[PDB]
Symmetry: C5
Amino acid sequence: VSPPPPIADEPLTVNTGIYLIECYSLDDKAETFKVNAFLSLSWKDRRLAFDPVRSGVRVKTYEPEAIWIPEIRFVNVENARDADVVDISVSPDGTVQYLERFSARVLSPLDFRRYPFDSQTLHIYLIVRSVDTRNIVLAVDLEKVGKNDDVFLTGWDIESFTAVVKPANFALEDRLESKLDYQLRISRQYFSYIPNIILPMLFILFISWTAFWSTSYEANVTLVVSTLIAHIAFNILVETNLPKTPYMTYTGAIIFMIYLFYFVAVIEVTVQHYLKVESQPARAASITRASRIAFPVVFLLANIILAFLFFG
Amino acid sequence: VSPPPPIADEPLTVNTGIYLIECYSLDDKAETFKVNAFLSLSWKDRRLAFDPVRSGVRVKTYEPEAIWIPEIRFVNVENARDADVVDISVSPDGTVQYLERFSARVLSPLDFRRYPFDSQTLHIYLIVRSVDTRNIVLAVDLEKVGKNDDVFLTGWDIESFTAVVKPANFALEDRLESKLDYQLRISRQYFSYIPNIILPMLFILFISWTAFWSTSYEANVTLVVSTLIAHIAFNILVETNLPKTPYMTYTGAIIFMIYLFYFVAVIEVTVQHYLKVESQPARAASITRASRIAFPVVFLLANIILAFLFFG
Amino acid sequence: VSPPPPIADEPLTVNTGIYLIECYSLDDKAETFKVNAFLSLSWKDRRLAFDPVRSGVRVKTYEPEAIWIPEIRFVNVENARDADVVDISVSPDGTVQYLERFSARVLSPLDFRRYPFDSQTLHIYLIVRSVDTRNIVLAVDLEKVGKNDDVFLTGWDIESFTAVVKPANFALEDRLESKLDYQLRISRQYFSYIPNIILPMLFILFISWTAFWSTSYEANVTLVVSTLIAHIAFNILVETNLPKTPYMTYTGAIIFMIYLFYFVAVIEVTVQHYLKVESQPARAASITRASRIAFPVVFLLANIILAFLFFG
Amino acid sequence: VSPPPPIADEPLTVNTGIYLIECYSLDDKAETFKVNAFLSLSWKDRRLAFDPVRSGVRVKTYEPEAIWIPEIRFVNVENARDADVVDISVSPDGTVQYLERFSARVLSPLDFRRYPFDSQTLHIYLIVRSVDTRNIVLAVDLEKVGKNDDVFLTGWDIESFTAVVKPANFALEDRLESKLDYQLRISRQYFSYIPNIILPMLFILFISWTAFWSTSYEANVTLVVSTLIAHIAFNILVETNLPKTPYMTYTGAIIFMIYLFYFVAVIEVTVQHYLKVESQPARAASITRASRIAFPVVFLLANIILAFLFFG
Amino acid sequence: VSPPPPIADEPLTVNTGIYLIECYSLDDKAETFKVNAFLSLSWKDRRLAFDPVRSGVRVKTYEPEAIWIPEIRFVNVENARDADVVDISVSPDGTVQYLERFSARVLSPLDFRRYPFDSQTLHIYLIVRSVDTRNIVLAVDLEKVGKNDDVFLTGWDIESFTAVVKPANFALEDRLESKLDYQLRISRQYFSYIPNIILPMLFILFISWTAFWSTSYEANVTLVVSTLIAHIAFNILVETNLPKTPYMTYTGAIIFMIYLFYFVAVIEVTVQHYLKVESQPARAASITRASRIAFPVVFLLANIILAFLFFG
């Protein structure tokens, strides 16, 4: 039908609010996730009001087809949402209440630069279609914004869920004042990563570092190269969960540094054996005794530098 | 169509019932499962009443779009259920019989705190929103709740499928709702895990422990490091199908313990070689003879303590 | 658009029939398969007795709409079939002819007790629900049951496709239903499994056994442990196919036996070295010479016993 | 609206034609691929004609729904094609032009017996629905068949695309029916296999064959067994892109040959060491000298014999 | 419902334009990328021009249907787009404004000759069919073609999104069609590839090379073969991504060169041992002294030549 008359001079306001029910399947490679929530809606329409004389219930219902309901669209969704109209009730004072239940698939960016200890924010954008007669603006009601007690994400924990009235849509066609942003702040659960990833890597490195206490060339070669193979194998477990990020990461820096340390250890073993063959054992002993202390200290300093760089 | 006439003394009640046909596709990483089942409803409409007189022996059977059907939805589903109506019958007394068949995908948490020998409970929720004229509450028909004898799940065995008879009424978004709970208790079939996982790891550990009866350095190093690599590969296989958790599991604790044991064995081999080279063979012999007994006993005690801690 | 009236109390019969066109995508882990075929029906409706003498000359052909067609469903399917009607024709006496083409994904359990050389049976179930005013039964018409010679399953031999004539009538949800069973017997092609799996395993086992002719500890350790690692990798490649089962299969038994043999070989090598160190070469020589004959004989005996146990 | 009257002496002939647009997703596990093309029909109907007088300048006419259109359905398709009519024109004589555009999934067998150097043939089948009034027989049209130069399949090159008639001696259809065959010939480009999968394996085998130029038992054992492990790893790599096939293959024969050669090499090394320890060095030298020449010649001859057994 | 009538012989032109919103899921093996964007159309239709003075309106809209809208279809898509009309508006002179929102999966070939540092161009094609006697041609509105500044793709740098203004007219199926081309130019981000793939490979190669400063045969064999195994594992990791291409890429050539280098290193070690055994230490010393310098220089020259060949 027709929109409400613009006889009222003030712009038409459509209050809004989303109530989350569940969020699931947050893919990391395509950075896409799904939602299932309640979409509430309300606006004032003085054209179709109600008087208490008809009945004392003070409540009347209507149909989706007979009453003009403004069209609200989602910006970043793969496909249009699935609408299931629930209930509408018209107060005697003209205010209407509109409900819907929808499910969607949302595209949002993710920043994996502190991958084990990162926090992400997921956005949902709302726009409206301007009507010919009057002016349509949006608003947020803090009462209709919330999340259920049974919202869970596998591996994450939800922190909060708010909204803003930002009318700052990128200018395309007369919609540069009719946007809305909903923010979902989440954090990753990182405790399981310690005993599953970090400590075995340190154990393998320390195993390979025992070559500085022996002078047998064959045993040193076996130790170092076999531990290198074990490190390459452990990279497979490191990779089977972490995404295929085409950019720098904390874990990537750690792995590259580990490769560098293995190379330097091989060089040290080679030079020690070569010096010992040339009837210069004192220099070889001095070099290996220096390396015994040099290696862990440099490893710890590089760890500290990297941690300060990425988290500060 | 309009709701049944408000008798102004009692809210409308609806008696539900779910009959399982088969369950399948219990995803472990996403904690989902798929269902196929019946759904039968029943309530009282004061109208549509007719006596058996005037050829009324044939009970009436209307069609959708001609009567009033309550909207009943599942809370924890990815998408709205795909359903098709089977039969609708109206008794001469005034009640109505309703049947339906649906398929759906359900989200439910899982608890892998005892992962090889765990038990899980799965939930299905039914909700209904009170209309603007009449209140609606739910009920349970205990003779229409059950499962086929042919309901099989791959990897699990089914124990019970009941329904809690007490709805949890509450008010949400300025309207009153009633929620039902269905519980499907299952247990895991753990027989396949023993000879495929547990025994080979024990064999590999016992193989790596043979280095205490030897005295050559190269053979000891080869044995221990190669067995460590084999353990890493078995860890690959084990963790290929186990989701990450915020708590500490059983298998993760055991795997970390075995990593610690390998590290300590490497340390002991290095110490023995270093002592032997420095011309103190008696001390090295005493150390290795002590370790021969010390290792299995400590392993046994640690395993027993862990089993008591988790399953106590 | 209403069920035909019975004469006095007799029920109505429908003669079904399925003609396979192609089977594909047989999953072991999911225990499903796909199929598309023809569904043929025929029943009696005497409200439409055609008279060719005066009212027309040719028998009537109808359209899917505005004609009473029995509802037919499949019990063990994930979702409802996607069927397109082909033709409906009415004979002068009153018997209706019907055809349609459909597809679905069928669920049926499998048996893996003889996995390399196992034979399976697959079931498809039809059903129909009795209306209040009429009772409906099902029947088989053997002239429309069959399969195309082009029906090919990748990796299986199709033997027969028959139906059990006698239905199974039962009362479910306070109504009478009838059920039909279609059995499709298939057998696995096992020749590809011999060179791909069986023989490399034997070659690696013999390579491991070749260590009883050597007297060097380092070489024996290298041989046995490297062959164990190769066996672990091949076990991973094999196990990527067979799902976990509550019972014990054949391949699992053979793999466990091979692990046992590896453990015993390691123990033998360790004992031989330990005895040789103590200046008792006679005992070590006797032990290794006895093992040279003991190992293959026991392997052969164990394999024969297992083959008799599982296939007898 | 009505089938054409059987007025002409010969039955009703339709001129068909398929014009490919692009192809993609040639899945090999399911032996299926998707298509996108045009479907142009043509038939004659003297019943309605547009004589060139009385404003008969309109050569063609547009009849979307008030005209008879034969039902053309595919045979080997998972689901019904997604077709939408493009153009409908009626010539003044009576010949009718028809045209659509469809997308579908095809099920055609694949044969990987010469996998690196194989060729395939993909079939698409067309059948027509008979009508009691007039007989309908399919007929190809040479000018309406073809394909774009913009078709492409990843890893394949297209040789030809033609059509031929094929009587339908199948489907047990009690009515007379006709079928059409469309054949697409594709040859795989094998160039990217010689430097990717073949030559590295030759290099690994030749590396393993250098154990015949040494007398050190430990070095020979390490060489041969580590190269066997490398062969297993390369087999794991190769398994990435090959199909999971249930029959014999050329590549499988090559892999089995390589395993056999590794076994024989280990046996030779053991024999040489056993003879050398037994104070018979001349025999060991003779055996090694024989092996140096024997191994490559036998490998080449067996490869020639396998290449003759296949490919002919 | 009817195409606009021509004046005498002139054709009808429609002005198009695509405003990008977001691109994602750029599959390299399948060579597809999903997309969703605004689509705009505009054309002149004088059969429904109005009088602004009498009607009292300055813009006139219509329902989504009940007006003649040209059929615009994409050529290289897997299926028809998921259209969503947003607005139809008309100008007083007769021009029709139009909007639409869609999403689709496109097909486009790629070039992988410079895979780490390559740039690609993606194509979107639009076509229209000539209905009636009114020829239809396309045109580009330069102020509507654009891209959102938030259009992002993971790992790619987006340079431009332009269109070729001149269409291409050709006769398909004895009918004329006009085609437009939309080009999206992107370049790959290569920084993450260097520390992930390039440098570990070099470190492993240098670890292999360190064997020219040694004399012990067992240590050299262990070093070279273990580094070869690690190289095979990294080959697995890299081959996970790249598809099969009929031509030779940069990475494939580099990998083959590395394989050849490993083979030559094994040969050199073998010949050094063979010469030293025959009591000729001087020749072996000279050979190894030469090889120490010879290997890195040859590697550098080969890399330089490859870089000049593929980029010159």
